[PDB]
Each structure stands twice: as structure tokens, then as C-alpha cells.
């Protein structure tokens, strides 16, 4: 499978999440995603085929994971935006006020701005600290997906949000949205990963 940010993958033939970013760890191919999407050694499938397994995760506390892929997978420096693509150029962390977009398999590609950093989300499982908040909307299934600027700087992976009963926060105004992502830079250094760029 071609590994592009934003696309759907399944975890042990049950949950669905979205690919965050293509990364390498020496000769190993992988992608970063949300920690709550699977446990270590959970099997990830893309389009019904086994592509790799969860190698490590931290959730709750943090919300991060990376999936080690088989050598047959094709890593690409890209995040899906409809039928188009955004090229991953690096991982400069944008500041509050900056414009940002996110990609995932439920709401597709949504943009908004960064409103706050170091937010704690109190999930049923435990708190996850240090999240950045944007007001781009998101829905159930978007977890793990890419947050990127139009200039191609990768920001982090979708963690959670104030979802309404329709499964997303796209029908409430931007001013009222809290969509939270886990910062990419600590995930890259914690696991010794390098971003695939183009």
C-alpha cells in the first residue's frame, strides 16, 4: 500500500484510525499515529491487507504511537487533501494564531488555526497532557491523522475533540471547537524516527 498521511487503516479488524506521517527508523519503515488507536503488536491493515503492527505507544498521559511496516509498503512524503496531496517539507512547530489543516478518513481535509498549546484532555481513560488545540473540525475516525500547515510543516497527530452526537464538531462554529493533536517533535525523538520529506 502507498502510505500517505490522512488515509484509513484498521486495527485488529475492528477499530479505524487515520495514518499520521511516513517515517523511518533506520532501515525500518513506519508511520506515526495516535496511541489510543492500538496496543503494541496490534495488526494494522490498509484496504484489507496487513501492512505492519504497532511497535510502541503511550496512551493516556500522552497519545502517540508508531506502526512498523513491512518492507513492501511505499512511504511517501504526502498528506491527502481530497484527490490532491500536500508535500511534507519538515516539522517546524507553528505558533498560536497560525493556520493549520488536518487530514483523516472521516471528515477529510479541514483547516482552521491553532488556538492554544499545552492543553490537558481528560479522557475516560486518564488525562493526556500537553496537547495543542486548533479549531479545524474533526470526527470519529480521524484520530492519528496528520495536522500540517499548507507550507508542508508537519505539526502532529489527531488525538481528540469535543464531538457532538453526529460524531464530529463540524456543525458547531469554529469559535466553539476544541480539536486536539499530539505534537510531532517529541514522538520523533522519543522513538528515534525521521520524517520522510519531499
Amino acid at each position: 500500500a502507498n502510505i500517505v498521511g490522512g488515509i484509513e487503516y484498521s486495527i485488529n479488524n475492528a477499530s479505524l484510525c487515520s495514518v499520521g506521517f511516513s517515517v523511518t527508523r533506520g532501515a525500518t519503515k513506519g508511520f506515526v499515529t495516535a496511541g489510543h488507536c492500538g496496543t503494541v503488536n496490534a495488526t494494522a491493515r490498509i484496504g484489507g491487507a496487513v501492512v505492519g503492527t504497532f511497535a510502541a505507544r503511550v496512551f493516556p498521559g500522552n497519545d502517540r504511537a508508531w506502526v512498523s511496516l513491512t518492507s513492501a509498503q511505499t512511504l511517501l512524503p504526502r498528506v491527502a487533501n481530497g484527490s490532491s496531496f500536500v508535500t511534507v517539507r519538515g516539522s517546524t512547530e507553528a505558533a498560536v494564531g497560525a493556520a493549520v489543516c488536518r487530514s483523516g478518513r472521516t471528515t477529510g481535509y479541514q483547516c482552521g488555526t491553532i488556538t492554544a498549546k499545552n492543553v490537558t484532555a481528560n479522557y475516560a481513560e486518564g488525562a493526556v497532557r500537553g496537547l495543542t488545540q486548533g479549531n479545524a473540525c474533526a470526527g470519529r475516525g480521524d484520530s492519528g491523522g496528520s495536522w500540517i500547515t499548507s507550507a508542508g510543516q508537519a505539526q502532529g497527530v489527531m488525538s481528540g475533540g469535543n464531538v457532538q452526537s453526529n460524531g464530529n464538531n463540524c456543525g458547531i462554529p469554529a469559535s466553539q471547537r476544541s480539536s486536539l493533536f499530539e505534537r510531532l517533535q517529541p514522538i520523533l525523538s522519543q522513538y528515534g524516527l525521521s520524517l520522510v520529506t519531499g
Binding site: 470526527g139 481528540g160 476544541s178
Partner: peptide, 4 residues
């Protein structure tokens, strides 16, 4: 806010 919930995970996703």
C-alpha cells in the same frame, strides 16, 4: 473532549 473524547479520543477520535
Amino acid at each position: 473532549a473524547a479520543p477520535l
